[PDB]
Amino acid sequence: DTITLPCRPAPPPHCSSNITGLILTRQGGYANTVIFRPSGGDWRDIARCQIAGTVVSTQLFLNGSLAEEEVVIRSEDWRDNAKSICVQLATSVEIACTGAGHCAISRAKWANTLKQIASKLREQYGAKTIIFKPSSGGDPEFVNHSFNCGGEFFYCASTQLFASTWF
């Protein structure tokens, strides 16, 4: 079973990539749960993570650098909800595009990735319940997972990737 993200326009098969990281925003305000969404920032947030490869992408790092042994999370200031949280994976997650308007990701591999991310965030914020929620909104490039490939620019709705609760 897989997670099938709608994309426009249709990414061709040679644009399938390896998700190597992602960038999150921690929701503000105040239940002992901590909520994360794909970043509400912009290109400055993405560049300062310093784990991207050559592909320009939002929300997810494609074909970037991998951590050595386990997931690593970093932030310029954990107490500032306006600073994004950089998540660098240790084993990549493949995202295969069919050329028909969708790119697919294994549900079990994505769930196991989110569990490791949740665990690292749990140790950083000393919480108990980590909740991933969809983008709060924004321009098409940032509310979607967007990325360039072969001179073309593609937009994939990512709401299915960020919708889980982890204890």
Partner: antibody, heavy 118, light 102 residues
Framework: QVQLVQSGAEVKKPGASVKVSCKAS????????MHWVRQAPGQGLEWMGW????????NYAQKFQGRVTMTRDTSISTAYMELSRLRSDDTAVYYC???????????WGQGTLVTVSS | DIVMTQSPDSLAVSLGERATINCKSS????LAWYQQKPGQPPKLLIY???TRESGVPDRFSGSGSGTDFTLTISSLQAEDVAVYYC?????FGGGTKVEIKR
Amino acid sequence: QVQLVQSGAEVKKPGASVKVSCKASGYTFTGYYMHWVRQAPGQGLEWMGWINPNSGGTNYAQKFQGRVTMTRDTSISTAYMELSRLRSDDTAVYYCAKISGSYSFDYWGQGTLVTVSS
Amino acid sequence: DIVMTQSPDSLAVSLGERATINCKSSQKNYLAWYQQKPGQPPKLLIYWASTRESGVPDRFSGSGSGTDFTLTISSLQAEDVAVYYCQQYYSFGGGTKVEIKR
């Protein structure tokens, strides 16, 4: 000179929505986050959320998630705060405020009084 | 997700005397202090806990580190009557209303 000019006072019925605007001049509008803060009469300052004017990304206070929407029109350097499903205890002065590099609010709008009443 | 509490809620100070406002966090220090008068937005007085904004008179000073911070008005003038707020990241303290003691 930096100035944030907000729209005029509004009287709304409970259950309606209000949209407050905040027009910025004197600085690069997309270079600094805009925050919204409200103040019920006689009470303190309550943070509502921020918007990144460059991308339109937002981060709302959990209290207002699903009720507030923050947008901006960069061609006219104007930020907007829409609050829907109004209750009487949303009666407050609503401020836009521009964060600085020292993470303080050096410039504020003059405030927009929103009165919710039947 | 950090709560800033201010004490007291209200402070009566005799003219020309010292006023001390406390701000404590519940968990470089990014504390800022604001002064609010009726019908106006808050006005920034101090940032980085102790740096005075341009134009702010020398009788205003901030200090503190870590968890406890203080705004001091060394010699209260009538024009200093107002509500004062501290701020760390995007949490504000509850406000301290400063009035003249007679």
